[PDB]
Design a protein around this ligand. Structure first.
Ligand SMILES: CCCCCCCCCCCCCCCCCC(=O)OC[C@H](COP(=O)([O-])OCC(O)COP(=O)([O-])OC[C@@H](COC(=O)CCCCCCCCCCCCCCCCC)OC(=O)CCCCCCCCCCCCCCCCC)OC(=O)CCCCCCCCCCCCCCCCC
Ligand code: SF4
Ligand SMILES: [Zn+2]
Lengths: 182, 244, 118
């Protein structure tokens, strides 16, 4: 058998038949495994929800480092005021990253010279197409495109490599026009 | 100014200054009255040069400890506004500002308060908290409230009506005071409890185990399981400190 | 009771139904409408209806004056209207009443009173 059945009747929690009527049912049933579907009164919904003993012992559940009373400041587990800013990049802020570079790969002059170099781009001093044409191969092939020269693809956060299940594990047999992917 | 600080001054001026530098270590010069008190054989008040060792002061100018130097639980070398010291650190620590500061303490009015092993140090610290509660001017928030929380806690740790993690709660309660006040009394209300926790923790935990065995279990805040507000009062548990 | 309508006619209503509640006649708040002003303004919708079967719950302002005062040793009384019989809170938030002053003092949530033993 598989991890998903079939299972007999004496493990299903339904009200069945008893005696000769069970022998007759297993004779006259397309699938004797199957149940009437009526729940078993002693078990289902017993004890009633308004008489559960477990409500007197119940206590509000918690997790340890948040219920810790001593070294549990809120300003460390304040994840709302740590929210990530909505970054905005107009063509000005992108040409500066092109003509100049970035904190990881600087290409900028030191001192007030480089400061006014930033200032020339903050205003309309140099344009995006001008610095796209003034960009050496190492700039584009490594900061706009890839090192291989190919453009990047629409990224996936959590990639999914699909797989097919066929034959016996599958939900439906081979003949049917539906299949099963893991 | 302090009385002594001006009282000495005519003599320092008359007599040349340099000899005062000749007393004591480089930055802790001179003589300093010491009011010894407590469970000492011969309580006394004396004058000595600074940077004198604590042990010579305890043994010579007084009668030594009552019951012997190894019948020593701790010592408080500046009064209640200074954390207690343990026996290990009383063996070689000079009675100056600097070295006492180097063992996370300090010299106050140089009033030594000695405590044998026959005493309840926790009873001494809760008393200092009851004092500071009585002497808070009541102006700034942390002293007004924190002192009373500290009293309500120390009165429970005295009988064990607590959990172990309440001690780290208590350390945070002192840090809620140590720098957020106007005057220095808030720091003085914090420090001794920091010194008790730093050194004599197991006595607290042992009294707590003693409560858990002799009375019953306990939760945060001294609430037991049978505790309840019945008819205007809490009835299902002991209430430490309430005298009114 | 005979209540004069605005239009010059009268409105007869029996005494058991003019009381503001079966335990109290008068109103317990200035903005409360007395039953007479209610009827006098709304008889069109009370006309063929039976007043015995309309809701007439008891007032609490009179059932709480009956409750005996409680006493305590100290300048504080704590109240928490907790059932003590079933699980959970089931009451009202803890409130520490000062009771140093000569008279009784009542919780603001429930009206239970407390005194300083005298
Ligand atoms: C004129 C109007 C008169 C109408 C009233 C008739 C009453 C009557 O004769 O009772 C007969 C009575 C009916 O059985 P029952 O007492 O009511 O069944 C109760 C059992 O607890 C039944 O136990 P169960 O709940 O587990 O059900 C078993 C069931 C299971 O039935 C099946 O699964 C068989 C599937 C149908 C097969 C169809 C073949 C035709 O089989 C039957 O009950 C008999 C069905 C025929 O006895 C007979 O079995 C005679 C059958 C003819
Ligand atoms: S810390 Fe000082 S100023 Fe503040 S309330 Fe206490 S005694 Fe008053
Ligand atoms: Zn109340």
């Amino acid at each position: 058998m598989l991890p998903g059945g079939p299972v007999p009747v004496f493990k299903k929690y339904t009200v069945g038949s008893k005696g000769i009527w069970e022998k007759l049912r297993v004779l006259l049933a397309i699938a004797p495994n199957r149940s009437t579907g009526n729940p078993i009164v002693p078990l289902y919904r017993v004890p009633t929800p308004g008489s559960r003993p477990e409500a007197n012992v119940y206590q509000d559940p918690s997790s340890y480092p948040t219920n810790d009373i001593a070294e549990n400041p809120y300003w460390k587990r304040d994840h709302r005021r740590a929210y990530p800013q909505t970054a905005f990049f107009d063509q000005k802020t992108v040409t500066g990253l092109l003509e100049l570079g970035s904190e990881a790969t600087p290409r900028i002059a030191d001192g007030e010279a480089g400061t006014k170099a930033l200032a020339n781009i903050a205003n309309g001093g140099v344009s995006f197409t001008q610095a796209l044409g003034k960009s050496s191969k190492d700039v584009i092939y490594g900061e706009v495109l890839t090192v291989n020269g190919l453009p990047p693809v629409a990224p996936t956060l959590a990639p999914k490599q699909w797989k097919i299940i066929e034959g016996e594990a599958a939900i439906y047999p081979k003949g049917y026009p539906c299949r099963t992917f893991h | 100014t302090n009385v002594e600080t001006v009282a000495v001054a005519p003599t320092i001026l008359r007599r040349g200054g340099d000899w005062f530098a000749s007393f004591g270590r480089e930055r802790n010069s001179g003589t300093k009255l010491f009011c010894i008190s407590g469970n000492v054989n011969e309580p006394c008040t004396v004058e000595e040069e600074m940077s004198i060792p604590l042990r010579e002061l305890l043994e010579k100018h007084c009668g030594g400890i009552k019951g012997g130097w190894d019948n020593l639980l701790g010592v408080i070398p500046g009064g209640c506004s200074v954390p207690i010291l343990p026996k290990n650190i009383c063996e070689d620590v000079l009675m100056d500002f600097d070295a006492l500061k180097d063992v996370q303490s300090g010299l106050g009015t140089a009033a030594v308060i000695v405590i044998n092993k026959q005493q309840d140090v926790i009873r001494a610290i809760q008393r200092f908290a009851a004092f500071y509660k009585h002497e808070s001017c009541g102006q700034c928030t942390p002293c007004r409230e924190g002192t009373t929380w500290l009293l309500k806690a120390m009165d429970r740790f005295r009988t064990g009506q607590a959990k172990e993690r309440e001690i780290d709660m208590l350390y945070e309660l002192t840090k809620d005071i140590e720098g957020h006040t106007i005057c220095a009394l808030g720091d003085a209300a914090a420090w001794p409890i920091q010194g008790l926790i730093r050194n004599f923790r197991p006595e607290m935990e042992t009294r707590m185990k003693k409560f858990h065995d002799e009375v019953g279990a306990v939760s945060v805040g001294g609430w037991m399981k049978d505790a309840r507000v019945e008819k205007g009062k809490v009835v299902g548990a002991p209430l430490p400190g309430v005298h009114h | 009771k005979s209540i004069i309508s605005y239009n010059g006619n009268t409105i007869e209503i029996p005494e058991e139904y003019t009381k503001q509640a079966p335990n109290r006649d008068s109103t317990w708040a200035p903005a409360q409408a007395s039953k007479t002003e209610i009827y006098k303004n709304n008889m069109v919708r009370f006309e063929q209806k039976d007043l015995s079967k309309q809701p007439m719950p008891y007032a609490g302002i009179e059932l709480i004056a009956q409750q005996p005062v409680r006493f305590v040793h100290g300048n504080t009384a704590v109240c928490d209207g907790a059932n003590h019989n079933g699980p959970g809170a089931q009451g009202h938030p803890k409130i520490f009443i000062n009771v140093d002053a000569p008279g009784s003092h009542a919780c603001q949530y429930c009206g239970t009173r407390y005194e300083k033993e005298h």
